[PDB]
Design a protein around this ligand. Sequence first.
Ligand code: ZG7
Lengths: 50, 201, 51, 201
Amino acid sequence: WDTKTMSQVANNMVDVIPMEFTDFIVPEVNKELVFTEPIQTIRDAVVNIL
Amino acid sequence: SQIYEIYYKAIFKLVPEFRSYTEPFARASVHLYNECKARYSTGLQSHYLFSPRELTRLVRGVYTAINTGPRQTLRSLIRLWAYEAWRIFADRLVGVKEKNSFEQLLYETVDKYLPNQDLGNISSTSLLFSGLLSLDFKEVNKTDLVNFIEERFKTFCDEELEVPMVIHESMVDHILRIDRALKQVQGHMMLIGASRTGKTI
Amino acid sequence: LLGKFAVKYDVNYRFIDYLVTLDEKMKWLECGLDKNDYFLENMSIVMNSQD
Amino acid sequence: TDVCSISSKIDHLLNKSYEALDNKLSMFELDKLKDLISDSFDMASLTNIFTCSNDLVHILGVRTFNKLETAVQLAVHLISSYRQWFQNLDDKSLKDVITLLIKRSLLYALAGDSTGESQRAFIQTINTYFGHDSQELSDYSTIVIANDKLSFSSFCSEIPSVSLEAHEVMRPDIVIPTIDTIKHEKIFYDLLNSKRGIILC
Ligand SMILES: N#Cc1c(C2(c3ccc(Cl)cc3)CC2)nn2c(O)c(Oc3cccc(Br)c3)cnc12
């Protein structure tokens, strides 16, 4: 499995679960730019970490 | 080139207006083969063997594609031919660099021999010729395949057992390859790869 | 990697203390598990897996 | 060491095949044929040729001593196949045909395991160590019984043109009539008809 396939599968599994709003998740985006998935929300942050 | 010029003329009796192009197709076919045989040698992987039988599977596949297809245009003929070339030559390749170089080789070959105006991306995932949704074998749209496989696979899991699997674009590609295998008269398939990656299901 | 992203955490997290209540924690030792933390984590993993 | 000479083994093989063929053939034809082969076949130039075999790149590497069977059996079978025609000929034309057959049999006995170019290069040697009056051997040359009995034609490329229907692309028994294939099928069936075993490597 490639990175894109893993990302798609992970996003699909993650999407169903509820996600409480967390104020700090936005200013981090600006910084790193590793370019490992389109910048978004917690859902992508979690996917990249995994 | 002579043998296959005869084969192309025979099969283009079904599409007689395009008979003139039988020469460049045959020449393209052997040229691709030679460079394939040259650049992907057995020194990379021991299963990289290429006989002239690769071209004979090719023409029979192209035949079948034409026989069970709709009205073609030259753009369609080239797309179809690209699909066949993909499923013959490149499925055995490992390494994304090898598939990318195969794309480059394909573009060069067609540019050399069939210089037409409306070819688009020739990526393996951009030319989903299907025979499932439609009665006749033709290049169908990715969205509709997705929705069809989702609903049918849901139905399959409801009717059979409880396995949770999420559809993804590689899965639908491999589905189409297996369909292509199983619909041949004597198609035997071999699925190399890792564990936990859906083969047996 | 968490601090590389926006995922903050308990800086003082401990897996055993996070996952295992004291009753189960004792219950295992009454059943005779060795009092070595590596074993405690292993026992947590094996009893907590479902399916 | 080997127990016998190459020459004596040739003589033995000749007599051995004569044991089979002589009873069927009538004596008047028989004697003229059998000395007509023995004397011509026993010349020194053929030995010269054997010494010129050992540097050629044979596949599988069977030593020249163990190749005489193929030469003798194929020669004697071939010559004996034309007996019904030979009876009317003048000596000159008969000698010519006999020479040409022996040269062709020597060629394939000694160089059929060689990769093509070696064979065409070896043809020059065969045409050189036999006498120039004797019929020249060419790779394309084939003998066809033209019009009445005894007007043999040494021609090449008599290729029939195949009118394939489209669906016959997937007849697995099909093949395209090509000069290479024509001569291989020819020599194959001749070797078969001599009742010798074959290995197609
Ligand atoms: N559930 C499931 C299942 C999975 C996982 C899965 C993968 C994709 C998706 Cl979308 C959902 C789940 C759970 C990780 N992989 N997986 C297979 O690889 C199967 O075929 C085999 C079996 C044994 C050896 C080999 Br080699 C192939 C059969 N089932 C599965």
